[PDB]
Amino acid sequence: FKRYVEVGRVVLVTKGEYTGKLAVIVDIVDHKRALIDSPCSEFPRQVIRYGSVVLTHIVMKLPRGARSGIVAKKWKAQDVCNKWASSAWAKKLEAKKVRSQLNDFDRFAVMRLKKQRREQVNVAV
Amino acid sequence: DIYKDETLTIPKGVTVDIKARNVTVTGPRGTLKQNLRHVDIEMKKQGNTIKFIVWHGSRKHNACIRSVYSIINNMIIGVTQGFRYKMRLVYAHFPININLTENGTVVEIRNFLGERITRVIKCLPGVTVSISSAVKDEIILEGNSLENVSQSAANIKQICNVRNKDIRKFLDGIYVSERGNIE
Amino acid sequence: SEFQKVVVIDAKGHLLGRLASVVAKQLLGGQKVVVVRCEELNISGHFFRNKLKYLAYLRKACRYNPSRGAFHFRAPSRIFQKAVRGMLPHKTARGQAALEHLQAVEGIPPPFDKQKRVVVPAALRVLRLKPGRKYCTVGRLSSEVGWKYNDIVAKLEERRKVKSAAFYQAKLAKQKKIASAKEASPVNQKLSQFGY
Amino acid sequence: ALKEYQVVGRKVPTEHEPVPKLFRMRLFAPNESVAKSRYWYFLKMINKVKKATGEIVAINEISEPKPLKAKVFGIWIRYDSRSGTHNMYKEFRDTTRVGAVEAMYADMAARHRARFRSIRILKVVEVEKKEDVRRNYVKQLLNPHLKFPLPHRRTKKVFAPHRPSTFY
Amino acid sequence: VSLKKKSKRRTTRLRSRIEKKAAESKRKQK
Amino acid sequence: PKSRRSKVLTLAQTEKKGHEGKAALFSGVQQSLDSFDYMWIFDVTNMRNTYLKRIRDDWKRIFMGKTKVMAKALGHTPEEEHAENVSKLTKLLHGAVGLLFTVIGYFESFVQNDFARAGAVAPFTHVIPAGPVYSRAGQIPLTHTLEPQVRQLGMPTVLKNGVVTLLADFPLCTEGQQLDSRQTRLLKLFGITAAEFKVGLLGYYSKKGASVEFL
RNA sequence: GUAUAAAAAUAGAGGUCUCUCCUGUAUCGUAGAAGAUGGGCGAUGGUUGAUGAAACGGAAGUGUUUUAUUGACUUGUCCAUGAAAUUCCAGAAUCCAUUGCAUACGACUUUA
RNA sequence: GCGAAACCACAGCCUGGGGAACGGGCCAGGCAAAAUCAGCGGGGUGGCUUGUGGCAGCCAAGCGCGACGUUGCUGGCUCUUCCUAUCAUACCGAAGCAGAAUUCGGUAAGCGUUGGACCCACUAAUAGGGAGCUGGGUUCCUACUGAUGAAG
RNA sequence: CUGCCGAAGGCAGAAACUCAGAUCAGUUUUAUGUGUAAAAUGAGAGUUUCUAGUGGGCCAUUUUUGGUAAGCAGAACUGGCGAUGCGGGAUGAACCGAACGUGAGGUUAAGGUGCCGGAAUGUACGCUCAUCAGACACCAGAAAAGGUGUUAGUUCAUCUAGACAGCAGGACGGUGGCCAUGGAAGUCGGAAUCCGCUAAGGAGUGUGUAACAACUCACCUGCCGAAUGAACUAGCCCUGAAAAUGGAUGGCGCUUAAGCGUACUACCCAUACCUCACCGUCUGGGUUA
RNA sequence: GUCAGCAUCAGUUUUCGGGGGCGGAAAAAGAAUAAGGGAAGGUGGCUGUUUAUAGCCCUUGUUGUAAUACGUCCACUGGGGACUGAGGACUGCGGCUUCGUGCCAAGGAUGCUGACAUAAUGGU
């Protein structure tokens, strides 16, 4: 578990208006800023500092300075999407997001469901 | 500089475990453990090579990479070949009396310039003191830790020190004569 | 981040000034604070400089009745209390009542060793001090300024850690049993689309 | 922040000079008013053209043609110090000329205690050639296999229940 | 703790006297 | 102001030419190539400057400059090389090799002995008797007045009663073992003539033949 | 809801060669005329109260586990009754006496 | 048992600051627990300054000056505490320091630094300074110290 | 008791009447040389008369001469103080804001947002470790400078013809050049200090020897493979002396700052600014129903 | 009489959100797609080379009259919160309405409702 700042490392934005989005480092601008892209259309090409992002463990082969078109091409080829989701870290994050999106009636659904989960508390003797 | 590196290739010394800056190097002669918590560097071990890596370190912190390189190398030399320090007892008129107890781990010294006192030292761990018959009045400190053997040597030399006498004429004392390895 | 009756702070690895300021703000807010394990508080600056700071603090004494002179407290808990009270208006009834809401102790006594001990990130040395910087320990500065109860606390802390490790192992085993039964229960997969 | 401006100006035409020459300068200022004053004093100190008898004929903000390509910019500047005179040349790797100038101002205020009025910028040029780069730290960034862990990780919600991770 | 031999804080006469005599120094060098 | 190693200086007043010296050496190499004959390839060895002067005496000149500097001046490519088939000769041209003008029999046979140097192997196992030091290892029919040598030796010796005395015998050299700096320095004070200067006459860059053999 | 107890490091930790952290937005709990009255179906569980006995906890033990016997409530799921005009928030010591190891007077040290 | 008077804006802890006059009131700190008793009298002006003189010339790192150099000439008797700028004691370094005795210098204020008419002894030494009294010379309260003392 | 007007270092007010003016201005333009003269903006402008109080001084500002280790002294103008409360600078006669009726709400100035303390333990980039750090405030007295502390620069140097360094070696022979001497061979001491060889061995950089001898550099060759060196400038840091009870960036404390510099947002509140109510004074319009 | 809650308003004010123009290099970028040029911090290939089994940079065309971004404006609009309710028949300035004792957010708050009275407010 190292998370070196490589060219082609996919990262998770954690500060700014693009919080929660997934990107990939295209170029390392300097000691304290980098250029990232993503196949998703809502996230444009921009230069972001390392304080507003956390590096993931997934590294994807990517030539330096590549345009967004082939970045999506290589992203789809190596299947980075749903490879990040395969990690339990993404499952926890999306579980939190669904739990935040949750409402009062469905909170009462969770009420009953986890009560039925505690129903058993059955342990072999 | 972003990445300052030093590389060490390990000889037939068996194990160089580096868990949490606490290196435990086991070789043919013995096993030495020593701590590196005082510095913050990467120790990346691959094959028979260890890389000491510092990222973005200042020059003050970069001064410690080669220091860590040297101490680990000295530890490897100790577990492979060991260290041996040879002192010659120098006396003008009063012979110096030396006694060895608990297999050389405590040295008692008498009659240094006609002393009625008993100067006693306890050797640092991993050090054994012997008297060699090849040359008269010859003291040998052998061990695995160079620091322990050499600091034992310093303790002997400083405790057997001439006070208030003119050193340009009074030459009596114990001095380190040769430094080397066992093999 | 919810108002508790009592907050037990495990002061290991914290910075004296930062933890004192956070605690002093909580006491004025009206919260009872118990700062346990005060022999592990960290102070920036190398040990010799800090001891010179403290030994200069001893120099302040009255020239008539040093019994009325400055009271130099050597215990690490009392050192933290002095740091905290200097950040409070203790000359008024509000500050004097705030001091009564703080209990700084040495080690973790039995009434507080069985309770959850939160930590303050704004005072943690690991998060707040640049690596490669010299620091000192209050439990070490205290021993070389006059504190004479270091050995007893260390022994009673080794006992406490042994007992706590045994307790955690028992609780971990029970949690493993509960965890194993979790996926065995079906509704945990049947209707888990809500994220739970 | 800063924006790069081009200011073109001339003195008011008279009988002596029916067609005065047109003087254009590329300069950096937070807004157009500061740029015009920045230009006027520069014109005074280089060509002795008074502000009263002159006029700003054209003001144009300039945007970076390729803000999405990382570039290396070398900056020639002149400093007013205790002696009142110094010359420096620095290199900054950034995707915009404006950001490079901002980084230069921050560095000089951090190192030589330099202010905006004390610093006058002679030339900000792009260095495409790797060999023409003189600064070792810039060359360190330009190496092909650059890699390094995150530096200065540093990490209301007071009273965290668990100890910080500050690692991977 | 101060940890000094000389106090880093200054008296009001002393701080006022600097602007009194620093200005005169500029007058003298002029 | 900066933790940097000090650079001491003296009053020698003997600064070298550097680039000018290299240019002069290249010009001398060209002149030696343009010289009449005898096409020697031998510049220096472990022998002393006295041996080099003695060798130069039997000539009317041994000169190579910095090694591979003359080879660079000549050029590996035959077009740049003044001679013919010098592409293979440049590779063989390494170490101290140079031309001369005056031979073959003297170079092959006459090899004067000289003090040995470190890195080689001693011809035998030289030993030193204990007690008082012997200047010629018993061959002197040997003053012990080398009192300063007692401090400057480092061998197991003690200056007793104004005479350097060795407590125990120390073997200075061993046959079949590489010579170290300490052994070479110790043998320098004694008569260790373990050297034999040689020369290389594999080929000759004749004006007409132009056949630089590699024998 | 007066709910939540390893330790240690942060240029590393823990779990079964493999996996996890990357914060408690987590976990336990959570319906009921402030918690009513009955009926089933499904499980030997949970909340546990009362006593009764074992062990553990001395750093300020402020409590912890283990049970046993029972009296309870047993939302586990599915049904039936009543709520309302709260009809728009609120045994000792001392004095008197005695002692002189004490003492300006108190106090003290003894006897009584 | 009898029973005053002087004095009285109000009072009563200290450190640093409050331009001054620093004060008790103001600022920032140390602190701070009733009621009292007997004693004794304390309290009613440069961030200065220090160890290296005056005139002329020669250089000349540099910006007509020009630094260091270099050469030319004539008040005492007892008292608490603090500072080190150390006389002695402790430990060190250097010196033709053989030993003994000694010189200079460093850390060092823990502990000492006398008796007599500058003089002569003793002493290991007789180091330098900061914050009740007398001689020749001009014609209440508060502090300190002891003593009780109600009270969870 | 309350209200209004309100100074002075010839004033402020009162009454008597001019002109609805080109009539004045602690002002700026235009023209001629701070003077004068004839467009901007503001204002209703005025004349004779008498009658209270005062005619001092402190602080700073810019213009000069006399000056000296060193400050200092004498002028002119300008303001502030004086008659002036309020916010901030820890507190303050002269520092930064702001001129004061009683209140409600909003917003700020100066200064600030770690706690005391209302307000971001905000964001971004750098610098600094101080066994007596800094928050200081033209850093002006010590001040001229020292430092193998660090970060940036400026100007000259060599460098895969192999850079610096490192180890191996050569570092010679005329010659122990000549006077000088007990003994001086490069190295107690007096002018150089020449030559054969080169790639280089200096009539010699130091140690040392009675003299020698021996080692070293300064000078070159072998291995070794890339950058390295010298002189200056800038910022921070140490030092650039100061004593006498306890001790002060205001305190606590702070070291990827809560110190230094810059940039950008957000936030805090004065009697100040804005909206409203009310009190009083003045001014203006109207008022025989 | 006291205290409350809400609605519709008026004055002041603070804090979010949407829509729409208009400007700059008629944003610069970018994407997609046709030319040519260059190379690297040199990929596949074989230290050296020129898109191949990765790609990058520069210029032009095009999609185009792209969007975005900032600035600016709307007599465009949707919310949240707070302080205030001065005045006291009628005129007035205005908009709807067919004029109308017509209505209206138009020369200053009205409407609805609840609780308490031995309580609450207010004074000391």
Side-chain angles (χ1 to χ4, degrees), chain C residues 136-164:
Chain C
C136 81
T137 310
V138 190
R140 162 148 166 72
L141 158 65
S142 295
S143 51
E144 293 78 325
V145 66
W147 192 51
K148 64 180 77 170
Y149 289 147
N150 174 57
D151 313 278
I152 318 294
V153 177
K155 168 171 62 184
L156 285 166
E157 217 64 25
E158 301 308 318
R159 299 187 216 215
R160 185 198 71 75
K161 291 181 185 182
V162 163
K163 296 203 293 174
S164 191

mmCIF file of all heavy atoms in Angstrom, chain C residues 136-164:
data_model
loop_
_atom_site.group_PDB
_atom_site.id
_atom_site.type_symbol
_atom_site.label_atom_id
_atom_site.label_comp_id
_atom_site.label_asym_id
_atom_site.label_seq_id
_atom_site.Cartn_x
_atom_site.Cartn_y
_atom_site.Cartn_z
ATOM 1 N N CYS C 136 9.511 16.889 23.286
ATOM 2 C CA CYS C 136 9.756 16.309 24.597
ATOM 3 C C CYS C 136 8.448 15.776 25.162
ATOM 4 O O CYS C 136 7.364 16.030 24.631
ATOM 5 C CB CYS C 136 10.380 17.328 25.557
ATOM 6 S SG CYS C 136 9.193 18.460 26.312
ATOM 7 N N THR C 137 8.563 15.029 26.255
ATOM 8 C CA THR C 137 7.420 14.440 26.935
ATOM 9 C C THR C 137 7.291 15.051 28.322
ATOM 10 O O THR C 137 8.284 15.186 29.043
ATOM 11 C CB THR C 137 7.563 12.919 27.041
ATOM 12 O OG1 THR C 137 7.898 12.380 25.756
ATOM 13 C CG2 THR C 137 6.264 12.296 27.508
ATOM 14 N N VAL C 138 6.063 15.427 28.689
ATOM 15 C CA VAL C 138 5.835 16.032 29.999
ATOM 16 C C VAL C 138 6.152 15.039 31.109
ATOM 17 O O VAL C 138 6.707 15.410 32.150
ATOM 18 C CB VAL C 138 4.393 16.557 30.104
ATOM 19 C CG1 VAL C 138 4.227 17.394 31.361
ATOM 20 C CG2 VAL C 138 4.041 17.374 28.879
ATOM 21 N N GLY C 139 5.811 13.767 30.909
ATOM 22 C CA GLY C 139 6.155 12.749 31.884
ATOM 23 C C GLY C 139 7.641 12.528 32.053
ATOM 24 O O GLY C 139 8.054 11.953 33.065
ATOM 25 N N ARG C 140 8.449 12.972 31.092
ATOM 26 C CA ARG C 140 9.899 12.942 31.210
ATOM 27 C C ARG C 140 10.458 14.235 31.785
ATOM 28 O O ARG C 140 11.336 14.191 32.648
ATOM 29 C CB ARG C 140 10.536 12.665 29.845
ATOM 30 C CG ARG C 140 12.012 13.019 29.754
ATOM 31 C CD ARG C 140 12.741 12.082 28.803
ATOM 32 N NE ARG C 140 14.068 12.571 28.444
ATOM 33 C CZ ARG C 140 15.112 12.598 29.263
ATOM 34 N NH1 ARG C 140 15.027 12.158 30.508
ATOM 35 N NH2 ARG C 140 16.272 13.073 28.819
ATOM 36 N N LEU C 141 9.961 15.388 31.333
ATOM 37 C CA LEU C 141 10.361 16.650 31.946
ATOM 38 C C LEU C 141 10.006 16.684 33.426
ATOM 39 O O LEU C 141 10.751 17.255 34.230
ATOM 40 C CB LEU C 141 9.711 17.818 31.204
ATOM 41 C CG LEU C 141 9.554 19.156 31.930
ATOM 42 C CD1 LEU C 141 10.908 19.779 32.239
ATOM 43 C CD2 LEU C 141 8.701 20.106 31.105
ATOM 44 N N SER C 142 8.884 16.067 33.804
ATOM 45 C CA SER C 142 8.478 16.050 35.206
ATOM 46 C C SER C 142 9.461 15.264 36.065
ATOM 47 O O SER C 142 9.791 15.684 37.181
ATOM 48 C CB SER C 142 7.071 15.472 35.334
ATOM 49 O OG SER C 142 6.124 16.311 34.701
ATOM 50 N N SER C 143 9.936 14.122 35.568
ATOM 51 C CA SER C 143 10.838 13.291 36.360
ATOM 52 C C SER C 143 12.157 14.004 36.642
ATOM 53 O O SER C 143 12.713 13.879 37.739
ATOM 54 C CB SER C 143 11.066 11.953 35.659
ATOM 55 O OG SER C 143 11.438 12.141 34.307
ATOM 56 N N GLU C 144 12.681 14.753 35.667
ATOM 57 C CA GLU C 144 13.879 15.563 35.871
ATOM 58 C C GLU C 144 13.575 17.008 36.259
ATOM 59 O O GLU C 144 14.379 17.901 35.959
ATOM 60 C CB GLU C 144 14.784 15.525 34.636
ATOM 61 C CG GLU C 144 15.437 14.174 34.318
ATOM 62 C CD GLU C 144 14.519 13.177 33.644
ATOM 63 O OE1 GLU C 144 13.318 13.168 33.951
ATOM 64 O OE2 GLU C 144 15.009 12.393 32.804
ATOM 65 N N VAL C 145 12.443 17.275 36.913
ATOM 66 C CA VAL C 145 12.248 18.585 37.529
ATOM 67 C C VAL C 145 11.797 18.373 38.970
ATOM 68 O O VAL C 145 11.764 19.316 39.769
ATOM 69 C CB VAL C 145 11.238 19.448 36.747
ATOM 70 C CG1 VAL C 145 9.848 18.850 36.808
ATOM 71 C CG2 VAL C 145 11.247 20.895 37.231
ATOM 72 N N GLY C 146 11.479 17.130 39.326
ATOM 73 C CA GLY C 146 11.094 16.838 40.694
ATOM 74 C C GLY C 146 10.016 15.789 40.897
ATOM 75 O O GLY C 146 9.885 15.260 42.004
ATOM 76 N N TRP C 147 9.233 15.484 39.862
ATOM 77 C CA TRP C 147 8.173 14.490 40.001
ATOM 78 C C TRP C 147 8.770 13.129 40.338
ATOM 79 O O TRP C 147 9.733 12.686 39.705
ATOM 80 C CB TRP C 147 7.348 14.411 38.716
ATOM 81 C CG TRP C 147 6.069 13.637 38.848
ATOM 82 C CD1 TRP C 147 5.105 13.811 39.795
ATOM 83 C CD2 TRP C 147 5.604 12.589 37.990
ATOM 84 N NE1 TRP C 147 4.074 12.927 39.589
ATOM 85 C CE2 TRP C 147 4.355 12.166 38.486
ATOM 86 C CE3 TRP C 147 6.124 11.962 36.854
ATOM 87 C CZ2 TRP C 147 3.620 11.147 37.887
ATOM 88 C CZ3 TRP C 147 5.392 10.951 36.260
ATOM 89 C CH2 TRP C 147 4.154 10.553 36.778
ATOM 90 N N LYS C 148 8.191 12.463 41.340
ATOM 91 C CA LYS C 148 8.786 11.265 41.923
ATOM 92 C C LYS C 148 7.873 10.047 41.841
ATOM 93 O O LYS C 148 8.080 9.075 42.574
ATOM 94 C CB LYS C 148 9.173 11.527 43.379
ATOM 95 C CG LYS C 148 7.986 11.820 44.284
ATOM 96 C CD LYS C 148 8.424 12.079 45.714
ATOM 97 C CE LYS C 148 8.996 13.475 45.871
ATOM 98 N NZ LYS C 148 9.216 13.823 47.301
ATOM 99 N N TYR C 149 6.870 10.066 40.966
ATOM 100 C CA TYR C 149 5.910 8.973 40.868
ATOM 101 C C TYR C 149 5.875 8.375 39.466
ATOM 102 O O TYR C 149 4.846 7.855 39.033
ATOM 103 C CB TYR C 149 4.520 9.446 41.286
ATOM 104 C CG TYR C 149 4.400 9.700 42.769
ATOM 105 C CD1 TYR C 149 3.569 10.697 43.259
ATOM 106 C CD2 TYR C 149 5.131 8.952 43.681
ATOM 107 C CE1 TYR C 149 3.464 10.933 44.614
ATOM 108 C CE2 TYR C 149 5.031 9.180 45.035
ATOM 109 C CZ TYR C 149 4.198 10.172 45.496
ATOM 110 O OH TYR C 149 4.098 10.403 46.846
ATOM 111 N N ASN C 150 6.997 8.439 38.747
ATOM 112 C CA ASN C 150 7.018 7.939 37.376
ATOM 113 C C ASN C 150 6.964 6.417 37.332
ATOM 114 O O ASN C 150 6.254 5.841 36.499
ATOM 115 C CB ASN C 150 8.260 8.451 36.651
ATOM 116 C CG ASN C 150 8.417 7.845 35.273
ATOM 117 O OD1 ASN C 150 7.522 7.946 34.433
ATOM 118 N ND2 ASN C 150 9.557 7.210 35.031
ATOM 119 N N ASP C 151 7.712 5.748 38.213
ATOM 120 C CA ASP C 151 7.787 4.291 38.168
ATOM 121 C C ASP C 151 6.444 3.647 38.490
ATOM 122 O O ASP C 151 6.049 2.668 37.848
ATOM 123 C CB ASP C 151 8.865 3.795 39.129
ATOM 124 C CG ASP C 151 10.163 4.563 38.992
ATOM 125 O OD1 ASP C 151 10.952 4.240 38.081
ATOM 126 O OD2 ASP C 151 10.391 5.492 39.794
ATOM 127 N N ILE C 152 5.734 4.177 39.487
ATOM 128 C CA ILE C 152 4.456 3.589 39.884
ATOM 129 C C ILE C 152 3.446 3.686 38.748
ATOM 130 O O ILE C 152 2.702 2.736 38.478
ATOM 131 C CB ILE C 152 3.931 4.258 41.166
ATOM 132 C CG1 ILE C 152 5.068 4.465 42.167
ATOM 133 C CG2 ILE C 152 2.826 3.419 41.786
ATOM 134 C CD1 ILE C 152 5.657 3.176 42.696
ATOM 135 N N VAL C 153 3.398 4.836 38.072
ATOM 136 C CA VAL C 153 2.459 5.007 36.967
ATOM 137 C C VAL C 153 2.788 4.052 35.828
ATOM 138 O O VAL C 153 1.892 3.439 35.235
ATOM 139 C CB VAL C 153 2.449 6.470 36.491
ATOM 140 C CG1 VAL C 153 1.523 6.618 35.310
ATOM 141 C CG2 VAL C 153 2.016 7.387 37.616
ATOM 142 N N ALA C 154 4.075 3.913 35.501
ATOM 143 C CA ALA C 154 4.466 3.009 34.425
ATOM 144 C C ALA C 154 4.086 1.570 34.747
ATOM 145 O O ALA C 154 3.584 0.845 33.882
ATOM 146 C CB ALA C 154 5.966 3.123 34.160
ATOM 147 N N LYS C 155 4.314 1.141 35.990
ATOM 148 C CA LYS C 155 3.934 -0.210 36.389
ATOM 149 C C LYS C 155 2.422 -0.392 36.338
ATOM 150 O O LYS C 155 1.922 -1.397 35.818
ATOM 151 C CB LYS C 155 4.465 -0.508 37.790
ATOM 152 C CG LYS C 155 3.894 -1.770 38.407
ATOM 153 C CD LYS C 155 4.619 -2.128 39.690
ATOM 154 C CE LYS C 155 4.457 -1.034 40.733
ATOM 155 N NZ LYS C 155 5.245 -1.317 41.963
ATOM 156 N N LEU C 156 1.674 0.576 36.872
ATOM 157 C CA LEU C 156 0.220 0.479 36.869
ATOM 158 C C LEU C 156 -0.371 0.644 35.476
ATOM 159 O O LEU C 156 -1.531 0.278 35.262
ATOM 160 C CB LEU C 156 -0.380 1.515 37.816
ATOM 161 C CG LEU C 156 -0.238 1.183 39.301
ATOM 162 C CD1 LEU C 156 -0.552 2.397 40.152
ATOM 163 C CD2 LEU C 156 -1.139 0.016 39.670
ATOM 164 N N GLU C 157 0.390 1.191 34.531
ATOM 165 C CA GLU C 157 -0.063 1.255 33.149
ATOM 166 C C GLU C 157 0.207 -0.037 32.395
ATOM 167 O O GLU C 157 -0.589 -0.417 31.528
ATOM 168 C CB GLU C 157 0.601 2.429 32.425
ATOM 169 C CG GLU C 157 -0.307 3.133 31.429
ATOM 170 C CD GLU C 157 -1.500 3.798 32.087
ATOM 171 O OE1 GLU C 157 -1.413 4.138 33.286
ATOM 172 O OE2 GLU C 157 -2.529 3.983 31.404
ATOM 173 N N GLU C 158 1.311 -0.722 32.703
ATOM 174 C CA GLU C 158 1.539 -2.041 32.125
ATOM 175 C C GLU C 158 0.470 -3.027 32.573
ATOM 176 O O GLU C 158 0.000 -3.849 31.778
ATOM 177 C CB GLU C 158 2.934 -2.548 32.494
ATOM 178 C CG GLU C 158 4.072 -1.651 32.026
ATOM 179 C CD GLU C 158 4.000 -1.324 30.545
ATOM 180 O OE1 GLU C 158 3.690 -2.233 29.746
ATOM 181 O OE2 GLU C 158 4.255 -0.157 30.180
ATOM 182 N N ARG C 159 0.075 -2.968 33.848
ATOM 183 C CA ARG C 159 -1.034 -3.793 34.317
ATOM 184 C C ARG C 159 -2.318 -3.453 33.573
ATOM 185 O O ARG C 159 -3.065 -4.346 33.157
ATOM 186 C CB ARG C 159 -1.237 -3.611 35.821
ATOM 187 C CG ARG C 159 -0.064 -4.005 36.696
ATOM 188 C CD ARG C 159 -0.469 -3.924 38.159
ATOM 189 N NE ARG C 159 0.616 -3.470 39.022
ATOM 190 C CZ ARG C 159 0.811 -3.899 40.262
ATOM 191 N NH1 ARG C 159 0.014 -4.798 40.816
ATOM 192 N NH2 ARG C 159 1.829 -3.411 40.963
ATOM 193 N N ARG C 160 -2.596 -2.158 33.408
ATOM 194 C CA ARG C 160 -3.831 -1.738 32.752
ATOM 195 C C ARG C 160 -3.863 -2.174 31.294
ATOM 196 O O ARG C 160 -4.904 -2.619 30.794
ATOM 197 C CB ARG C 160 -3.992 -0.223 32.864
ATOM 198 C CG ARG C 160 -5.305 0.303 32.313
ATOM 199 C CD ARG C 160 -5.229 1.797 32.055
ATOM 200 N NE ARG C 160 -4.381 2.113 30.912
ATOM 201 C CZ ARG C 160 -4.727 1.924 29.646
ATOM 202 N NH1 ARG C 160 -5.909 1.430 29.317
ATOM 203 N NH2 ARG C 160 -3.866 2.243 28.684
ATOM 204 N N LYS C 161 -2.735 -2.047 30.591
ATOM 205 C CA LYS C 161 -2.685 -2.469 29.196
ATOM 206 C C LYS C 161 -2.878 -3.976 29.068
ATOM 207 O O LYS C 161 -3.527 -4.445 28.127
ATOM 208 C CB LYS C 161 -1.363 -2.035 28.565
ATOM 209 C CG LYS C 161 -1.240 -0.531 28.378
ATOM 210 C CD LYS C 161 0.078 -0.157 27.723
ATOM 211 C CE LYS C 161 0.245 1.352 27.647
ATOM 212 N NZ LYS C 161 1.511 1.738 26.966
ATOM 213 N N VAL C 162 -2.313 -4.747 29.998
ATOM 214 C CA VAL C 162 -2.495 -6.196 29.980
ATOM 215 C C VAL C 162 -3.965 -6.551 30.177
ATOM 216 O O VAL C 162 -4.527 -7.377 29.448
ATOM 217 C CB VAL C 162 -1.605 -6.862 31.046
ATOM 218 C CG1 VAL C 162 -2.080 -8.277 31.332
ATOM 219 C CG2 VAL C 162 -0.155 -6.867 30.591
ATOM 220 N N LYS C 163 -4.609 -5.931 31.169
ATOM 221 C CA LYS C 163 -6.021 -6.204 31.417
ATOM 222 C C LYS C 163 -6.887 -5.750 30.249
ATOM 223 O O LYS C 163 -7.835 -6.445 29.863
ATOM 224 C CB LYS C 163 -6.467 -5.527 32.711
ATOM 225 C CG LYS C 163 -5.777 -6.055 33.957
ATOM 226 C CD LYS C 163 -6.614 -5.798 35.196
ATOM 227 C CE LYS C 163 -6.715 -4.312 35.492
ATOM 228 N NZ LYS C 163 -7.645 -4.031 36.619
ATOM 229 N N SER C 164 -6.582 -4.583 29.678
ATOM 230 C CA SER C 164 -7.361 -4.087 28.548
ATOM 231 C C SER C 164 -7.193 -4.979 27.324
ATOM 232 O O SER C 164 -8.153 -5.206 26.579
ATOM 233 C CB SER C 164 -6.961 -2.649 28.226
ATOM 234 O OG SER C 164 -7.872 -2.062 27.313
#
